[PDB]
Amino acid sequence: TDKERFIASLMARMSNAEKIGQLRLVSVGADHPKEALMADIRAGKVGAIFNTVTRPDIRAMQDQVRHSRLKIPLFHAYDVAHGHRTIFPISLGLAASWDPEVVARSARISALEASADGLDMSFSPMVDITRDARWGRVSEGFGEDTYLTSLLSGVMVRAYQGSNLAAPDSIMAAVKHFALYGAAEGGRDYNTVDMSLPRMFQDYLPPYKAAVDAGAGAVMVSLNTINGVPATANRWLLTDLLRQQWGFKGLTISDHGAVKELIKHGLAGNERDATRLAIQAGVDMNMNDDLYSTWLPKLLAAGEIDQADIDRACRDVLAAKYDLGLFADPYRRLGKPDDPPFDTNAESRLHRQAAREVAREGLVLLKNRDGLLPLKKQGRIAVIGPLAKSQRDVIGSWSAAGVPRQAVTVYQGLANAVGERATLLYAKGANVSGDQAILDYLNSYNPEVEVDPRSAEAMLEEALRTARDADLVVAVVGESQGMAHEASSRTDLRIPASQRRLLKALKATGKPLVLVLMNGRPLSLGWEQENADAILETWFSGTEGGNAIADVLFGEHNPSGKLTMSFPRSVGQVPVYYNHLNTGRPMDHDNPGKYTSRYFDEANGPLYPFGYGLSYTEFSLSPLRLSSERLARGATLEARVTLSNSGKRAGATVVQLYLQDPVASLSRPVKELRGFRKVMLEPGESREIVFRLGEADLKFYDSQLRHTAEPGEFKVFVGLDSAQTESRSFTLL
Amino acid sequence: TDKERFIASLMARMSNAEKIGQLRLVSVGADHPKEALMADIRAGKVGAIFNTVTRPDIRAMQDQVRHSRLKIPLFHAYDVAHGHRTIFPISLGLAASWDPEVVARSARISALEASADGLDMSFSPMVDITRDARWGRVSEGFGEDTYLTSLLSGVMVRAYQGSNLAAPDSIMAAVKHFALYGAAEGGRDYNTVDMSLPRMFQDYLPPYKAAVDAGAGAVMVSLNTINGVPATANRWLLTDLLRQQWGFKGLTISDHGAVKELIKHGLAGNERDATRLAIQAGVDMNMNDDLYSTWLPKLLAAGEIDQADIDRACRDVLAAKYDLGLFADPYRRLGKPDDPPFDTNAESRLHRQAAREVAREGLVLLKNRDGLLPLKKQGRIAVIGPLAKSQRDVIGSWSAAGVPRQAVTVYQGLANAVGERATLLYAKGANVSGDQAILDYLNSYNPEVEVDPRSAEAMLEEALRTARDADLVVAVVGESQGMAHEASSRTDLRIPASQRRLLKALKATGKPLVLVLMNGRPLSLGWEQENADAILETWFSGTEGGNAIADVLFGEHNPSGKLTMSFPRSVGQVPVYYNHLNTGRPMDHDNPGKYTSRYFDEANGPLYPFGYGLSYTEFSLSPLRLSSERLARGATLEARVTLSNSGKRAGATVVQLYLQDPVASLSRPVKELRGFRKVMLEPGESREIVFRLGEADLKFYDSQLRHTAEPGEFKVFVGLDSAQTESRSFTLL
Ligand SMILES: OC[C@H]1NC[C@H](O)[C@@H](O)[C@@H]1O
Ligand SMILES: OC[C@H]1NC[C@H](O)[C@@H](O)[C@@H]1O
Numbered sequence A, B: 001t002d003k004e005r006f007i008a009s010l011m012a013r014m015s016n017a018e019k020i021g022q023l024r025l026v027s028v029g030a031d032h033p034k035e036a037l038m039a040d041i042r043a044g045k046v047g048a049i050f051n052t053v054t055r056p057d058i059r060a061m062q063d064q065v066r067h068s069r070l071k072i073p074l075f076h077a078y079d080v081a082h083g084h085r086t087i088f089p090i091s092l093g094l095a096a097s098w099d100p101e102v103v104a105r106s107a108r109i110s111a112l113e114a115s116a117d118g119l120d121m122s123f124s125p126m127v128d129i130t131r132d133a134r135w136g137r138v139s140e141g142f143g144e145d146t147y148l149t150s151l152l153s154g155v156m157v158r159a160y161q162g163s164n165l166a167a168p169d170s171i172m173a174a175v176k177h178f179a180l181y182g183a184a185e186g187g188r189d190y191n192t193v194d195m196s197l198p199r200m201f202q203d204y205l206p207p208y209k210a211a212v213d214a215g216a217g218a219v220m221v222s223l224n225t226i227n228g229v230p231a232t233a234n235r236w237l238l239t240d241l242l243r244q245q246w247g248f249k250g251l252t253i254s255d256h257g258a259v260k261e262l263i264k265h266g267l268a269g270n271e272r273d274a275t276r277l278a279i280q281a282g283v284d285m286n287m288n289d290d291l292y293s294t295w296l297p298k299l300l301a302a303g304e305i306d307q308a309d310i311d312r313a314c315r316d317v318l319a320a321k322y323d324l325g326l327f328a329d330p331y332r333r334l335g336k337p338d339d340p341p342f343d344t345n346a347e348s349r350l351h352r353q354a355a356r357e358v359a360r361e362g363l364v365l366l367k368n369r370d371g372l373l374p375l376k377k378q379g380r381i382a383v384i385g386p387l388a389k390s391q392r393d394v395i396g397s398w399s400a401a402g403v404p405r406q407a408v409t410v411y412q413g414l415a416n417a418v419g420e421r422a423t424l425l426y427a428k429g430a431n432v433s434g435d436q437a438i439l440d441y442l443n444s445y446n447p448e449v450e451v452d453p454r455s456a457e458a459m460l461e462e463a464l465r466t467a468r469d470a471d472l473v474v475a476v477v478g479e480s481q482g483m484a485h486e487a488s489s490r491t492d493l494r495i496p497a498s499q500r501r502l503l504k505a506l507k508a509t510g511k512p513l514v515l516v517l518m519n520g521r522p523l524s525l526g527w528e529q530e531n532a533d534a535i536l537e538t539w540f541s542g543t544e545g546g547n548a549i550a551d552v553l554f555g556e557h558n559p560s561g562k563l564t565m566s567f568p569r570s571v572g573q574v575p576v577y578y579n580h581l582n583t584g585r586p587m588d589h590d591n592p593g594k595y596t597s598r599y600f601d602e603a604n605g606p607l608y609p610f611g612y613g614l615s616y617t618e619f620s621l622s623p624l625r626l627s628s629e630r631l632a633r634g635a636t637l638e639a640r641v642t643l644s645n646s647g648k649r650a651g652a653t654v655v656q657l658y659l660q661d662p663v664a665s666l667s668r669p670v671k672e673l674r675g676f677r678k679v680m681l682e683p684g685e686s687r688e689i690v691f692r693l694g695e696a697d698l699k700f701y702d703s704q705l706r707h708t709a710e711p712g713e714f715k716v717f718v719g720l721d722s723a724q725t726e727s728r729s730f731t732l733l
């Protein structure tokens, strides 16, 4: 192959200093001042940059490469999680679209905008399975389901990379965080992960394998222990599974300071030993801590590592740079040398219409009493709450190069929608938290949350007056983006107390109460489900979020979002997830018993189940029909249902197919998602939906990690959520 | 062996109907009316009885055996968890004594009283490791620590069984629940258990192995899945581990309906298949569901099981009956019918003095502002709260044949202590819950909780009046015993809301506030720790609990209890446990950082850590001294410290020794308990404490379950709790 000969030929000319230099991944900042970094690039001591994100800045780095002996080009990476400049909903919101094409569009546009600024790589997609709502990084994933997350994992990779990694509108996908990062004990970030191999193989690993199989060029290794072994030192995970079993041929990248952290994990007593563990486990590239550059020469000289460990890692970095086209033209994403200067943040370089259309699809209607929604554009509308005018929160956590001043707030979305037809009245009502320590945490690094100097009582008095002067209240409440963020684990899943006090006070006005929720995690909403007139889940909906939200509230878009993560009744029920085991003593709702698996001091089950979301119309399903009672090995089974819009407005819903294996060599879940179809229907319109199932859909990992479909009964469920299904049985032969 | 020959010789004369009859374990109930059961005993269709617990009732069962062809004697079993008639503190409270001799005494007296009533066996000790306070069965274990629970597991078995299982003051120990029952996901009873084999072998399995190694005659198999396989169907657990690797020679007993529940777990489509899975996994004896008696003949006839499966199970039952002496004399625990009559419940048959002395040892002083405790016997003492006059709650869950009317309430204990020297003023103050649905749940089977018909406001008004004219308030608050019980999982770890409203109202009177907590699980006590003057944790202290509690409150006993389970600040922090891993990013208490493993919305770490407990005196430790800096393989290390009573009152504390292995092939806990010494000291008295460490204390299970000690540094910590330690290092060679 031309590639392996080109790289072998280059590596033949390289010193070990230069080979080791290729493994170093750094960003400009206090740890690495710009001038020292420029010198290191010229010395061949830098392989890649992260957090340098504009054409002039990236050109200036790539210009330093020209001064190096071998002129090996840099690659430039960034956290393009859910948009680059045009910010789409957070991934948890994108997942709620239940539309691979909507997700692909957000990823395609992200890659286009990032590559347009000179970037070659995103640290995305994040594909960690999340069953614990306390974890601040649940916003970054696709929810609790292995099938949906695996599917969207593949979609994100393919959308980012396109048909050619050398294309100037493509970037390389570095799938993260390999592995199991979202199972952190207590939902505390960075915390211990401990799980059985059958659960690991069946539920948590498939999304990373889906990204590898979609051709992801890079894998970012996680910060957590797996069964006592940090992923960064886990040769089983990075060599035996990722390379030998899965056949991954690309680049492994450490997370930030992950190699040095092997000391705190207690796998290493010093930096030299930590360095040896990471490179021999199969970590190619060393983020920020510089341990590889410091210790690899001494390890090699001493015979503590092999030349083959350095060569493997170096070949992987050069092979990434080759696939990205950077050996053909290191300026392929940076334009021509006499291109005129331009404003990186020009309105003309955004994709607002795409962001607005994508953002509409993820909004989930959780409650709508007496058809209060959609609203009429008339009278007086009170817009109340600390998130109503927040540009910083609507773009969410991991907002990349998104500019808060360019974002549309919920307030501005309503003003754009009503024009002169209605009067909008604003009141802040409350600070995002009443706890000064939480406000100081959120404002610790930068001013992220505006702290109103009024007393809580004064802000409430203004909100009650505003509400009393309106026909209805749109309360814009929930989390600031810093509350659903790396290292922001919550012990309380409710709306913050300052905002719940505001909601209780607004009920005293007797005005219809619409809640617009902004949040990066499932919330506990028992009070709200009892007391609010309508509830719209908007996650953090991005740059055009306010416009998409007004589109739903005024009925231009019929809410079509469905949850991809169960909403617990309280943090005391964590974890709750739809695909749980039956136990030997399941709750019997027809014959309730004390001696069943349940809590006695709270209603059982999630407040809102996986796949739940309402519409402004009604939908019906015909009885489920299977193509046969028996399925021969290697044949496919057809499951058929007719969906009807039995209401008065056009709208979409999601037909969900679930499977149960009720008798197996392992206890298998009560249901597992195995298919879905999002369908848009006119009033009175019907569509026949056909699902195809084969052996592949019936397999599970048994006690001995055999991936097998066992003969016997399977139950097929079809429904518009995980809770309201009809089922039919067949036998596998 | 005479034993093997006796059993072989009996089994030679037995039909398969009789062999199968030996496996049937039943109790009188709706499922098995007394007379049907008596007829079955006469027909040789019953192997053993549970929940028949008096000499006349057991004599009548054993009398029926005479009518059967082979006259094989029954054994009789019961849940003697923490006392038979004289009720000791719940196991969680017994553990807090940190005194193996106090635990052995409670077990010895339990076996004495149980055997005196005719019982041969207890379904005890319960030795499940518990890290999740939501689980209702936490009360039945010894807390979160593998070393302490394993130690006490051994102590309970040896105290029950004595030097001879045929002794009429001995019973057989059936250690439960094998295995991992207390790691239930969500702390929901009966729920999924999923963990790595290294965590399983290092932390959760050793207590069951400790009971096997102490010579436990029986093992009760748990109701939960382990990594997807119900324990009842788990051939790896019951045959490979328990029989071949651990060398257990005794009897395996299913939990209640566990065999039939294999259908609900989804391992079996029918009773016949469930029966086959349980007997071939290695379950000898079938509790209540009668599947063995129904299906084993058909399974054998059809060649679905071997004769060897029936013979193995039958030999194990006959071998237990042999060891219990029942073939020598089936009436050895039952005296003779012409014996002088006695009342089963006679005061003369109780052990009140032992119960009072044992109960003093487990009480944990959690707070004592400005030396409010101990109280003087003078003035006016308001005794307020729904647990003040509760006889049913002081004896706790699994109270066996304990008679509530024989128990000493906290109120009666204070009356007994003060005589005419002080005036006691009572007010109920609140019901145990303000939620009528929780009260109805607690009163579902029997009247367990007295519901005052007065409004919450009327009871508060009376309590405030009582408080107003007293010198101080002893608030007796917490859980009823039915809240910390099999199948009573909580989503809230606080004192119930009706009682917290009462505490806030009492705090507002400005009167000194002493909290006497009754509870079967760790509670979240943030408000109480901030606001109460003194807090005494009494668990459920048993038959003499009120007397032991008054002994501590008036200073006759200097509180010496220490926690064996971490108290979380809230249910949102679950799990918290002292022997956690460091992570790559631990909270730094000298330099707190956002990007650490923590919550942002609540103070971090437990409110009260493992090993915490105050005294009415103060104690000092001299610097820790190790016998050498290096330890040779097979040598023992000595760790020496001097403990002093530096205060004015005699009292006991517990010197705790912890070990850390800071560099290993797995990430190892920050600390692990490896020794302790409870020491009683006069004011100004000193004692030299010497701990011995060898290789056995330094070993751990690596990723491949190699059990060895790796050469390198170990850190030794000594202190009066897990949080406040001094450390010294040595090197293993
Ligand atoms: O920002 C770079 C890198 N740092 C930290 C995060 O854990 C990861 O998600 C991100 O890609
Ligand atoms: O009472 C019989 C048996 N049933 C249920 C419990 O799980 C166990 O602890 C007890 O021994």
Ligand SMILES: [Mg+2]
Pocket (backbone or CB within 6 Å): A661, A662, A663, A664, A710, A711, A712, A713
């Ligand atoms: Mg099956």
Ligand SMILES: [Mg+2]
Pocket (backbone or CB within 6 Å): B661, B662, B663, B664, B710, B711, B712, B713
């Ligand atoms: Mg070591």
